[PDB]
Amino acid sequence: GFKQDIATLRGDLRTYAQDIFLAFLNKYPDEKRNFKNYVGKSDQELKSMAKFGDHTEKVFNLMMEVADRATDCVPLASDASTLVQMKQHSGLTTGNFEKLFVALVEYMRASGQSFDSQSWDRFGKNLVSALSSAGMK
Numbered sequence: 250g251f252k253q254d255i256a257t258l259r260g261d262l263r264t265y266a267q268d269i270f271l272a273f274l275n276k277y278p279d280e281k282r283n284f285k286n287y288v289g290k291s292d293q294e295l296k297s298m299a300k301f302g303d304h305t306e307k308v309f310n311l312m313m314e315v316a317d318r319a320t321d322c323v324p325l326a327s328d329a330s331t332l333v334q335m336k337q338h339s340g341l342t343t344g345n346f347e348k349l350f351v352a353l354v355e356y357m358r359a360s361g362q363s364f365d366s367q368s369w370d371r372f373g374k375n376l377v378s379a380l381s382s383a384g385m386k
């Protein structure tokens with residue numbers, strides 16, 4: 250289920266994190282207006298770029314913490330607040346987050362592995378709800 254999936258992703262997180270983020274950028278190429286320095290690069294070229302690997306892993310490190318702290322795929326309001334208040338998130342709207350979770354669930358459904366994709370869809374929806382409640386446009 251969802252808690253086991255957190256353990257699965259954590260056991261190979263740099264790889265999963267880069268593969269899901271690449272799935273997101275390829276499904277939604279207009280999302281690169283928040284990643285100017287990732288324009289005009291193939292997947293293998295991005296996985297050679299220091300900030301790509303390090304920023305994407307740090308993102309998924311904290312995503313796994315928020316998922317781990319959730320009850321029944323509902324995040325803590327302290328975590329949603331952190332994600333809204335972060336200077337790094339100044340530009341963003343809830344639809345940026347919805348698109349990331351769409352890509353993440355599609356990734357999971359394509360894997361041969363027994364991911365609980367319905368739980369990840371609920372999590373993404375619940376995080377979007379929480380971000381809206383914590384003041385994200």
Ligand code: MH0
Pocket residue numbers: 280283284300303304305307308309311312315332337338341345346349376
């Ligand atoms: C597509 C929009 C977008 C979404 C969705 C998004 C979703 C998430 N984020 Fe977060 N984040 C986005 C846009 C950014 C930007 C633009 C930056 C700045 C750093 C950069 O460009 O590498 C950033 N996020 C930076 C970060 C950083 C700091 C990275 C670093 O500087 O090394 C963390 C920890 C982070 N986020 C957390 C999270 C978490 C957790 C989620 C999932 C709930």
Ligand SMILES: O=[N+]([O-])c1ccc(O)cc1
Pocket residue numbers: 270300301304305308349
């Ligand atoms: O997965 N994400 O949403 C990310 C990935 C990398 C990054 O630099 C910022 C956000």
